[PDB]
Amino acid sequence: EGPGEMGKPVVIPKEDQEKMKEMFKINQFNLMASEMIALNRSLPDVRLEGCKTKVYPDNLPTTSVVIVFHNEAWSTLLRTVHSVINRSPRHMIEEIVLVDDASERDFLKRPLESYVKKLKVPVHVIRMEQRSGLIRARLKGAAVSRGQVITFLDAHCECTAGWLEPLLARIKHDRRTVVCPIIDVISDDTFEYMAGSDMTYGGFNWKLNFRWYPVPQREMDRRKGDRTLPVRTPTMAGGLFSIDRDYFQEIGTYDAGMDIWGGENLEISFRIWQCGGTLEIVTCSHVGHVFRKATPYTFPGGTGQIINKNNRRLAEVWMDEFKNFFYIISPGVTKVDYGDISSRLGLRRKLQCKPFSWYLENIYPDSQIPRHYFSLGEIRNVETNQCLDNMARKENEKVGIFNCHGMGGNQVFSYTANKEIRTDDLCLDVSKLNGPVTMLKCHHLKGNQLWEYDPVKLTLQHVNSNQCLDKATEEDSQVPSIRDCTGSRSQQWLLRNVTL
Amino acid sequence: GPGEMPVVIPKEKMKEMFKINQASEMIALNRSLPDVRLEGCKTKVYPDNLPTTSVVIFHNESTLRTVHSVINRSPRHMIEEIVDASERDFLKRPSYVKKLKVPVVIREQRSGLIRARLSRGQVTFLDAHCETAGWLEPLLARIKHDRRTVCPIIDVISDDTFEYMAGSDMTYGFNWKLNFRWYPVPQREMDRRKGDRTLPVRTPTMALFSIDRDYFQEIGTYDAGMDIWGGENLEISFRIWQCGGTLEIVTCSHVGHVFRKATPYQIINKNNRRLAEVWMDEFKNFFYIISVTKVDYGDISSRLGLRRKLQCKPFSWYLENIYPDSQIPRHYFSLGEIRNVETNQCLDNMAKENEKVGIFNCHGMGNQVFSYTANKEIRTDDLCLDVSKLNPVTMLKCHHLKNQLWEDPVKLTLQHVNSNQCLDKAQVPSIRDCTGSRSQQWLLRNVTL
Amino acid sequence: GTTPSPVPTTSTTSAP
Amino acid sequence: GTTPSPVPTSTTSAP
Amino acid sequence: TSTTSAP
Ligand SMILES: *[C@@H]1O[C@H](CO)[C@@H](O[C@@H]2O[C@H](CO)[C@@H](O[C@@H]3O[C@H](CO[C@H]4O[C@H](CO)[C@@H](O)[C@H](O)[C@@H]4O)[C@@H](O)[C@H](O[C@H]4O[C@H](CO)[C@@H](O)[C@H](O)[C@@H]4O)[C@@H]3O)[C@H](O)[C@H]2NC(C)=O)[C@H](O)[C@H]1NC(C)=O
Ligand SMILES: *[C@@H]1O[C@H](CO)[C@@H](O[C@@H]2O[C@H](CO)[C@@H](O)[C@H](O)[C@H]2NC(C)=O)[C@H](O)[C@H]1NC(C)=O
Ligand SMILES: O=c1ccn([C@@H]2O[C@H](COP(=O)(O)OP(=O)(O)O)[C@@H](O)[C@H]2O)c(=O)[nH]1
Ligand SMILES: O=c1ccn([C@@H]2O[C@H](COP(=O)(O)OP(=O)(O)O)[C@@H](O)[C@H]2O)c(=O)[nH]1
Ligand SMILES: *[C@@H]1O[C@H](CO)[C@@H](O)[C@H](O)[C@H]1NC(C)=O
Ligand SMILES: *[C@H]1O[C@H](CO)[C@H](O)[C@H](O)[C@H]1NC(C)=O
Ligand SMILES: *[C@H]1O[C@H](CO)[C@H](O)[C@H](O)[C@H]1NC(C)=O
Ligand SMILES: *[C@H]1O[C@H](CO)[C@H](O)[C@H](O)[C@H]1NC(C)=O
Ligand SMILES: [Mn+2]
Ligand SMILES: [Mn+2]
């Protein structure tokens, strides 16, 4: 009956709705509800039947949990620390390190210390006096920690039954394995607990956004169908993961030359894979996280700050030629000073890390960036001199045809080796004779996403419909058509490579 | 004929005239000089339509004489034109260049050589105090033969009497401390040329030279993040060799330069650190060991990135193929101090030719650094320990041809083979018939990063 | 931006 | 400092 | 999305 016990949603009665919304602005989640929920509330056991029978070796390495926070709410922070204390075998926890990144909250100062000193696990509170990024706060917290494994968690998380033993067992099996739990969803509206799927892992798109993506078939075949064995994830979300401390040091920790705007998750994923380690989602380990739609904090220095510094650093250090897929869709990013990456290039040199192509081929063959392609650039009609343009539209919407601006971005397409017409993680799709040319999630299963570009006839033939791409019609003038092939110059297209 | 073709002491003030620029009172700007190219270069006729050169020249210099050195000795059809803050009476508007038949002024902010060097001719850098027949055609012909070819023979112009003395075509290197130094051209370079001295020498390092402008740009010019304290010569030599180009001392080209002993105008090892970290690979340590690993050398990201773009080879390829006679050994069995087991003291060179090596308390702090090389030498910088008589241990320029040969990791004895005597305790070690004592035992341990 | 939630998506088709 | 001058130690070729 | 500007 207690609010939220067992992951139950907390619905606020309408009498209070208004006040709730105001309280909602502080953390960009329902604070009114979180404060009704017990700091030790019960949650469901969400592990796959088959993880519950697993017996893990003894002498597993103790872990230090590093939780960094900036203006976290009292209830969420304390629920996180209680969730790790109460749901972790006591002998497997060295300590909890709470890193206060220059928080401006009364309860996060002396009250936090008074409360935490009364816990049965040693919980330390380290203070960044200057607003520092998550990178810097985590480096501080790890430098202070003593446990052989370092577990990073956000300050609005809730561990579940049996979350820790799988991670520590995987690390003891191989110290060069970096492990992430399955990140369950804790509703920012009701704080309802919802389990995440073991069939979803981490990748990225041409924009260098971290993205959730379906676990592909090869990964089920490798495990011969056993979902309880860890998944090799191309990328990590970044909020939650564990790593042996000495190996964390050996791979170069985080890029200390990065600013506060994020990106380290992709950088460290690329670094771990290319430099000889393994990154895994441990499917028997679950930990919930309050995903939010926007951040509740600003970053120091106002707005309009130069962003994509860290994306440039990671791309220039690790991504090789493929960095272009980012640069070409981001007009102007090539003039942002990304500082000094010398130590990072030298680290790549020391460890003889493999090329990004090896990563795309072996770790992420289902990548959104194509490892091989026939063209990257604009798709121009011979007759009307216009270019296809995704118009920033989302899945299931029509691709447009407009005047070529030559600035790249939303008029960039790639005729890939899989013979897709792709723009980031969308592919041109036709599912009806004369139908509209829509943009759907690329599925790597050809079919209606299969096109033939004749390099001499310059025709773009949709294979399953057997119709050619053609200029817009009078009734739908801002959209290309697909029509029985005619040999016209309106059905010819230039798919050239744009360079620097 | 003042100085035409030596200046005698003007005895019964010269001391004053010389140190200002670190004499030359009657020397003509149109002075005669000997033709110093080897007979056999004069028979060579070099192709036509040779690319025109822009000659880049000045700091508180009479020398002007350098401009005439190019003008009077340049085929007019091979010069396109002649191109720092000088705060002196004559170093202003004083008009003369507008009266020369060749087109010849930039200057503001005191800037280094890199910044000053950073034209219309398709190809030449020259100092402001240089001065020979047929000097340009060889350079331009080798350039035309390969635009990725980067030096004249630099003759010595006396800083005391200004007498002209030709330099040998058989000298073309660098030592620990990353100093450029002159060293004899080795046998491999003559065997490649089958004895023909008139073909250019492939020089491991540079100090004046000519280069095609487009290839100059293709390699990234000079390191713009460097300060004014020099070093760019080794950097650009390493870059040219490792990154697929060719650097040469062209023996049919002679040009004089007044080498000096000191300049009229702290640790300034920034540029050295940049160069070593970008091009020298593992080998950077040989510099670090004798000099401090905390000099802030700025940002080298662009330089590593250029090394990535131009697909340059490693410094090991350079040491093995371009400079196998390097002072830095490509392989060595020991690098560190040479400590005696009995007295616990260390060899110390105390900083030159023909001198005795000393031994003092080991401080572990430079002058006590030695290397037992793969060539079985005991070398310190550009010197090797040498003994020339049964029973003194002197320091002689390393010659890379075995009495500098020494030999035992289990007995720890250093046996000079040609003498058949071991090094032993004494302010100088001794050489004595080997006895097996702990006074004849030595620890040759590796100093660690 | 903020880490995306692993939201359920529309079903993909396996054949045309 | 100033570039070293190209002037010659007498070097010996064999002992 | 990237910089539009134009029609
Ligand atoms: C738009 O821009 C893109 C990107 O630059 C261009 O695509 C590249 O085109 C080149 C030239 O064809 C490609 O290089 C070729 O790759 C072929 C296939 O690679 C095999 O080998 C690699 C080894 O790592 C495998 O990973 C891969 O899976 C393949 O197995 C080779 O067949 C080519 O070699 C051919 O020539 C050599 C001699 O030169 C022969 O010895 C070979 O036997 C063979 O005949 C060549 O190496 C490059 O891979 C492409 N990049 C991609 C696909 O990402 C587009 O061409 C360009 N579009 C236009 C219109 O210009
Ligand atoms: C979380 O912790 C609180 C505090 O210990 C637990 O509260 C207990 O609830 C039971 C059931 O009413 C009482 O009998 C105990 O006396 C309570 N303890 C205290 C100290 O008040 C709560 O049950 C815990 N939640 C769980 C286990 O789900
Ligand atoms: O300047 C900052 C911004 C964020 N954080 C912390 O870093 C974690 C990740 O931030 P956030 O939860 O806002 O991002 P999201 O998980 O939504 O992607 C959180 O524990 C934040 O409190 C920090 O320490 N310093
Ligand atoms: O601040 C400076 C220092 C040096 N130089 C130039 O650097 C060249 C080389 O200096 P120097 O002749 O003393 O070296 P050397 O040939 O004697 O070894 C000279 O032409 C100077 O004009 C310059 O232009 N600005
Ligand atoms: C000293 O270090 C060099 C460089 O690796 C090595 O080749 C040599 O064997 C070492 N000498 C020892 C260990 O005596
Ligand atoms: C399946 O149908 C959808 C439309 O509903 C898409 O066209 C998709 O591309 C199809 N899948 C294949 C493999 O053709
Ligand atoms: C050649 O002579 C000098 C001494 O005069 C050197 O000691 C050198 O070691 C001698 N031996 C050689 C070159 O093999
Ligand atoms: C800007 O966004 C619009 C969508 O409204 C168009 O896609 C346009 O092509 C974009 N211009 C770019 C990316 O340069
Ligand atoms: Mn978070
Ligand atoms: Mn000079």
Q: What is d(CA B45, CA B36) in angstroms, rounded to the nearest whole number?
A: 17
- Binary contact (C6, A200; C-beta < 8 A): yes
Cβ D5–B179 below 8 Å, yes or no?
no
Q: Kindly report the CA angle at A356 between A439 and A276, in degrees rounded to 5? A: 130
Chain C residues closer than 8 Å to A239 by CB: 3
Q: Ligand 6 mean position to A233 CA, how many Å?
A: 26
Query: Burial, B262: exposed, middle or buried (Cβ in 10 Å; 0-12, 13-18, 19+)?
Result: exposed
CB A30 within 8 A of CB A21: no
Ligand 3 pocket residue status of A72, Cβ below 6 Å:
yes
Taking a C-beta distance cutoff of 8 angstroms, is the pair A21, A12 a contact? no
Q: Are B202 and B170 in contact (CB under 8 A)?
A: no
Q: Is-contact A360 A368, C-beta < 8 A?
A: no
Cross-strand bridge partners of residue B397? B383
C3 lines ligand 3 (CB under 6 A): yes
Residue in E2, E3, E5 to test binding to A, most A beta-carbons within 10 Å: E2
Which residues does chain A have within 8 Å of residue C11's beta carbon, measured at their own beta carbons?
Answer: none
| Residues of chain A neighbouring B301 (CB-CB closer than 8 A) | 339-342, 345
Which of A320, A323, A342 is best to mutate for the B interface (most B CBs within 10 A)? Answer: A342
Residue of C nearest to A297 (CA): C2
Ligand-binding site membership of B265 (annotated): yes
Question: In angstroms, what separates the C-alpha of A48 from chain E's closest C-alpha?
Answer: 39
Flag whether residue A332 sits within 8 Å of chain C, measured between CB atoms. Answer: no
Q: What is the DSSP string of A348-359?
A: HHHTTPPPHHHH
Helix axes A342-350, B301-309, angle to 10 degrees: 50
**B146 close to B114: Cβ distance less than 8 angstroms:** no
Residues 6+ apart with CB under 8 A from A87: A159, A160, A161, A163, A164
Atom nearest to A292 CA in ligand 3:
17
Judged by a CB distance cut-off of 8 A, whether residue A208 touches chain E is: no
Q: Is the CB of A362 under 6 A from ligand 1?
A: no
∠ CA A250-A251-A253, nearest 5°, is 95
Q: Which chains are within 8 Å of B by 3+ CB pairs?
A: A, D
Structure tokens at B252: 């049919």
- Domain B270-321 indexed as CATH 1.20.1250.20: no
Q: Compute the distance between CA of residue A114 and CA of residue A101 in angstroms, rounded to an integer.
A: 19
3-class DSSP assignment, residue A204? strand
What is the helix (H) or strand (E) element at residue A150, kind and residue range? strand A149-154
> Which residues of C, range 1-16, sit inside 8 Å of A by Cβ?
1-7, 9-10, 12-16
Measure the CA angle with vertex A155, ends A152 and A157; round to 5°: 85
Residue B437: phi, psi to the nearest 5? -75, 165
Residue ranges lining ligand 7, Cβ < 6 Å: B 386, 388, 396, 399, 401-404; D 12-15
B129 is in an annotated binding site: yes
Atom of ligand 2 lying closest to residue A38 CA: 1
Answer whether A271's CB lies under 8 Å from A258's CB.
no
Map residue A194 onto helix, strand or coil: strand
Q: Which ligand is nearest to the CA of A300?
A: 3
A255 contacts A267 by C-beta, under 8 angstroms: yes
- Tell me which fold the domain A14-289 belongs to: Spore Coat Polysaccharide Biosynthesis Protein SpsA; Chain A (3.90.550)
DSSP classification of residue C3: P
Picking from A219, A205, A210, A232, the residue whose alpha carbon sits closest to that of residue A368 is: A205
Quote the ligand 6 centre to B411 CA distance (angstroms).
79
CB atoms under 10 Å from CB of B221, counted, come to 13
Instruction: Judge if the beta carbon of residue B228 lies within 6 A of ligand 4.
Output: yes
First to last CA, chain A: 62
**Scanning the structure block, which residue is given the tokens 């331009």?**
B140
Q: A373-494 maps to which CATH number?
A: 2.80.10.50
Decide whether any atom of ligand 3 lies within 6 Å of the C2 Cβ. yes
Architecture in CATH of B332-443: Trefoil (2.80)
Domain boundaries, chain A: 14-289, 309-362, 373-494
| Cβ atoms within 10 Å, residue B215 | 17
Residue with tokens 């003039």: A335
Evaluate whether the domain defined by A309-362 bears CATH number 3.10.450.50: no
Q: What's the 3-state SS for chain B?
A: CCCCCCCCCCCCCHHHHHHHHCCCCCCCCCCCCCCCCCCCCCCCCCCCCCCCEEEECCCCCCCCHHHHHHHCCCCHHHEEEECCCCCCCCCCCCCCHHHCCCCCCCCCCCCCHHHHHCCCCCCCECCCCECCCCCHHHHHHHHHHCCCECCEEEEEECCCCCCEECCCCCECCECCCCCECCCECCHHHHHHCCCCCCCCEECCCCCCECCCHHHHHHCCCCCCCCCCCCCHHHHHHHHHHHCCCECEEEEEEEEEECCCCCCCCCCCCHHHHHHHHHHHHHHHHHHHHHCCCCCCCCCCHHHHHHHHHCCCCCHHHHHHHCCCCCCCCCCEEEEECCEECCCCEEEECCCCCCEECEEEECCCCCCCCEEEECCCCEEECCEEEECCCCCCCEEEECCCCCCCCECCCCCCECEECCCCEEEECCCCCEEEECCCCCCCEEECCCCCC
Chains that touch E (3 or more CB pairs under 8 A): A
3-class SS string, A207-274: CCCEEEEECCHHHHHHCCCCCCCCEECCECCCCCEEEEHHHHHHCCCCCCCCCCCCCHHHHHHHHHHH
Residue range B14-257 in CATH 3.90.550.10: yes
Ligand nearest to the CA of B371: 5
> Rounded to the nearest 5°, which phi and psi values hold at A392?
60, 20
Strand order in the sheet with A373-377: A373-377, A413-416, A421-423, A426-429, A438-441, A397-398
B418 CA distance to ligand 7 centroid (A)? 10
DSSP one-letter code for D6:
S
Q: What are phi and psi of B373, to 5 degrees?
A: -85, 170
Question: Atom 5 of ligand 4 has which residue's CA nearest to it?
Answer: B113
- Spell out which residues line ligand 5, taking CB within 6 angstroms: B 333-335, 446
Asked if A99 and A66 touch (Cβ cutoff 8 Å), the reply is: yes
How far apart are alpha carbons A190 and A33 in whole angstroms? 7
CB D2 within 8 A of CB B261: yes
Inter-chain touch A342–B305, beta carbons under 8 Å: no
Listed in sequence order, the DSSP H helices in A330-397 are: 342-350, 356-362
Q: Using CA atoms, how far apart are residues B103 and B135, in angstroms rounded to an integer?
A: 19
Q: Do A340 and B299 lie within an 8 Å CB cutoff?
A: yes
Determine whether the interchain pair D14/B401 forms a contact, defined as Cβ–Cβ distance below 8 Å: yes
List of residues 6+ apart from B226 with CB closer than 8 A:
B112, B114, B232, B235, B270, B271, B274
Instruction: Please check whether the two domains, A309-362 and A373-494, share a CATH topology.
Output: no
List the helix and strand counts (H, then E) for chain D: 0, 0
Q: How far apart are the first and last CA of chain E?
A: 15
Least CB–CB distance from B418: residue in D2, D11, D15: D15
Phi-psi group of A123: left, alpha or beta (phi > 0 → left; psi -120 to 50 → alpha; rest → beta): beta
- 3-class DSSP state for residue A336? coil
Is B127 annotated in a binding site? The answer is yes
The Cα A368–Cα A234 span in angstroms is 11
Residue owning the nearest CA to atom 2 of ligand 7: D12
**Token pair belonging to B404:** 């500098």
Which one-letter amino acid corresponds to residue A426? L
The secondary structure of residue A315, as a DSSP letter, is I
- Alpha-carbon distance of A276 to A347, in angstroms, equals 13
Q: Centre a 10 Å sphere on the Cβ of residue A353 and count the other Cβ atoms it contains.
A: 22
Judged by a CB distance cut-off of 8 A, whether residue B289 touches chain D is no
Q: Does A444 touch chain C (CB under 8 A)?
A: no
> What is the C-alpha to C-alpha distance for residues B407 and A468, in angstroms, rounded to an integer?
80
Q: Are strands A397-398 and B79-82 parallel, antiparallel or unpaired?
A: unpaired
Instruction: Kindly list the strands in the beta sheet with A493-494, ordered across the sheet, starting from the edge strand earlier in the chain.
Output: A400-403, A386-389, A380-381, A493-494
Residue A80 in 3-state DSSP? helix
Burial of A277 from C-beta contacts in 10 A (0-12 / 13-18 / 19+): buried
Q: Which of A5, A8, A40 most suits a substitution to test ligand 2, by most atoms within 8 Å of the C-beta?
A: A40
A499: CB partners within 8 A, 6+ apart: none
Interface check B207 vs D, CB under 8 A: yes
Q: Do chains D and B touch (3 or more CB pairs under 8 A)?
A: yes
Query: What distance in Å separates the CA atoms of residue B102 and residue A70, rounded to the nearest whole number?
Result: 70
Strands B332-336 and B370-373 come out as: antiparallel
Q: Do B262 and D11 touch (CB under 8 A)?
A: no
b/e code B104-113 from CB counts within 10 Å (16+ = b): beeeeeeebb
Name every residue whose Cβ is closer than 8 Å to that of residue B85 and which is 6 or more positions away in sequence: B107, B108, B109, B110, B111
Measured distance CA(B202)–CA(B322) in Å, rounded? 8
Q: Say if A447 is an interface residue toward chain C (CB within 8 Å).
A: yes
Q: Around Cβ B6, how many Cβ atoms within 10 Å?
A: 12
Sheet of B415-416, strands arranged across: B415-416, B421-424, B430-433
- CA dist., res. A437 & res. A428, Å (int): 6
E7 lines ligand 8 (CB under 6 A): no
Which residues partner with A214 through β-bridges?
A200
- Return the beta strands (E) in A1-62 as ranges: none
